[PDB]
Amino acid sequence: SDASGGIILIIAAILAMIMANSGATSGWYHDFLETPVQLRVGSLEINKNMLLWINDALMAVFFLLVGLEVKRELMQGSLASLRQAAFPVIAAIGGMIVPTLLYLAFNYADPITREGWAIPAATDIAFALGVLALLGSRVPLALKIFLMALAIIDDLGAIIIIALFYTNDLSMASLGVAAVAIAVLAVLNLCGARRTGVYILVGVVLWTAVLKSGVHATLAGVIVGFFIPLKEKHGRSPAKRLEHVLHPWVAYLILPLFAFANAGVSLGGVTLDGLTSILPLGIIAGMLIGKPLGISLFCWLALRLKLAHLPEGTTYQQIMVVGILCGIGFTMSIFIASLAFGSVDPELINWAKLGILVGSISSAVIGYSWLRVRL
Ligand SMILES: CCCCCCCC/C=C/CCCCCCCC(=O)OC[C@H](O)CO
Ligand SMILES: CCCCCCCC/C=C\CCCCCCCC(=O)OC[C@H](O)CO
Numbered sequence: 378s379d380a381s382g383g384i385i386l387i388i389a390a391i392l393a394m395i396m397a398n399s400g401a402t403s404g405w406y407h408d409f410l411e412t413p414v415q416l417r418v419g420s421l422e423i424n425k426n427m428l429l430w431i432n433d434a435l436m437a438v439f440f441l442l443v444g445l446e447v448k449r450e451l452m453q454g455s456l457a458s459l460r461q462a463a464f465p466v467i468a469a470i471g472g473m474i475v476p477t478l479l480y481l482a483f484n485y486a487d488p489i490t491r492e493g494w495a496i497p498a499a500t501d502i503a504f505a506l507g508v509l510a511l512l513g514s515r516v517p518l519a520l521k522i523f524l525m526a527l528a529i530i531d532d533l534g535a536i537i538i539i540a541l542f543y544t545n546d547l548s549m550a551s552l553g554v555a556a557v558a559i560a561v562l563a564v565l566n567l568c569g570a571r572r573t574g575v576y577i578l579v580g581v582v583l584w585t586a587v588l589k590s591g592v593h594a595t596l597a598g599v600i601v602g603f604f605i606p607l608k609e610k611h612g613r614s615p616a617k618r619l620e621h622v623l624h625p626w627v628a629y630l631i632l633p634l635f636a637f638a639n640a641g642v643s644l645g646g647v648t649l650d651g652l653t654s655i656l657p658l659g660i661i662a663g664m665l666i667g668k669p670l671g672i673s674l675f676c677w678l679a680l681r682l683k684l685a686h687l688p689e690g691t692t693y694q695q696i697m698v699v700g701i702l703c704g705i706g707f708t709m710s711i712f713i714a715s716l717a718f719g720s721v722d723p724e725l726i727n728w729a730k731l732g733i734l735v736g737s738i739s740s741a742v743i744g745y746s747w748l749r750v751r752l
Pocket of ligand 1: 458529
């Protein structure tokens with residue numbers, strides 16, 4: 378499902394680029410996405426443009442899946458112990474620090490564009506795993522597990538740090554209702570509730586309470602995915618079945634719809650001097666240099682001073698290639714960019730997207746080349 382998921386994602390992005398650039402469709406594409414919307418449901422109203430609504434829904438579902446996965450990794454997978462978590466965690470710290478530092482090298486003096494610091498810290502898990510899948514049985518499963526954990530730690534870390542920066546966007550009552558909802562999820566888990574539906578219902582309450590803040594609405598999905606029990610009772614667990622049923626819908630519908638609504642950008646007026654502007658160049662440097670350099674360097678240090686061990690079945694060369702692949706930020710990076718610039722100016726988000734596209738495509742091509750050499 379990895380290879381076909383990546384291919385369908387790329388098709389949707391190409392269709393977006395066609396929509397945003399052809400005279401027959403460009404007008405409607407942009408006008409529809411820009412439309413202000415307010416949904417009627419009692420004494421509870423909220424105003425957001427069409428694209429933001431779409432992204433909130435799609436990313437709530439995607440990060441519900443991310444929540445299930447990270448909980449499974451912390452309880453059963455490669456994050457279930459210090460011994461196994463050391464290497465992916467140190468790698469993710471590097472993949473966070475170095476891309477941010479290279480982005481801010483260009484953008485720290487700009488009070489507007491510095492808000493996009495996390496853009497090249499993101500990794501498009503579907504795209505990167507799809508490029509891995511192109512080598513088939515030559516890829517050690519441990520390498521895929523490593524890439525998955527790395528990307529999820531960086532993506533969740535970005536979302537969480539941004540959420541902490543954005544807390545002031547929520548009201549006292551919103552935070553209160555959210556706290557009570559999270560507490561209900563916790564007691565449901567600790568007591569032994571195993572029907573997925575009850576968690577989903579309390580989860581939509583949590584999601585609506587923090588819906589004014591897109592990043593918090595996204596984090597709500599993670600929280601719900603985290604508190605759905607994973608204990609294998611009689612060979613069954615609601616988290617396993619939910620992840621299994623949800624994964625195809627995310628890989629084949631949610632993420633392609635997101636890419637179709639977000640990856641299309643006009644190419645008229647774009648220039649070589651425009652691409653070398655601080656915002657797109659900071660993104661490109663973060664992805665093409667920051668990601669592989671941070672991941673490889675922090676991993677090398679972890680191994681040399683014996684802080685961590687290579688995952689069995691992998692080599693350090695393979696880890697370096699994964700470091701390149703983690704520069705494929707694509708849809709996750711576009712989402713981070715919408716969180717930073719979405720409510721500021723269309724020129725900013727479009728140039729951020731152009732930078733993301735150059736960095737992502739270049740990371741994919743270079744990573745696949747090195748992958749063919751090493752595997
Ligand atoms: C804002 C800060 C960044 C937020 C980043 C979000 C991602 C969180 C997961 C990464 C840490 C992994 C923790 C691994 C801890 C070791 C696990 C352990 O030793 O626990 C033993 C226990 O038996 C277990 O079942
Ligand atoms: C409210 C902030 C709380 C943050 C607590 C996180 C602590 C985790 C540290 C280890 C991972 C490395 C994290 C490095 C994160 C990049 C630096 C950063 O977040 O600051 C960028 C700044 O916003 C540009 O304007």
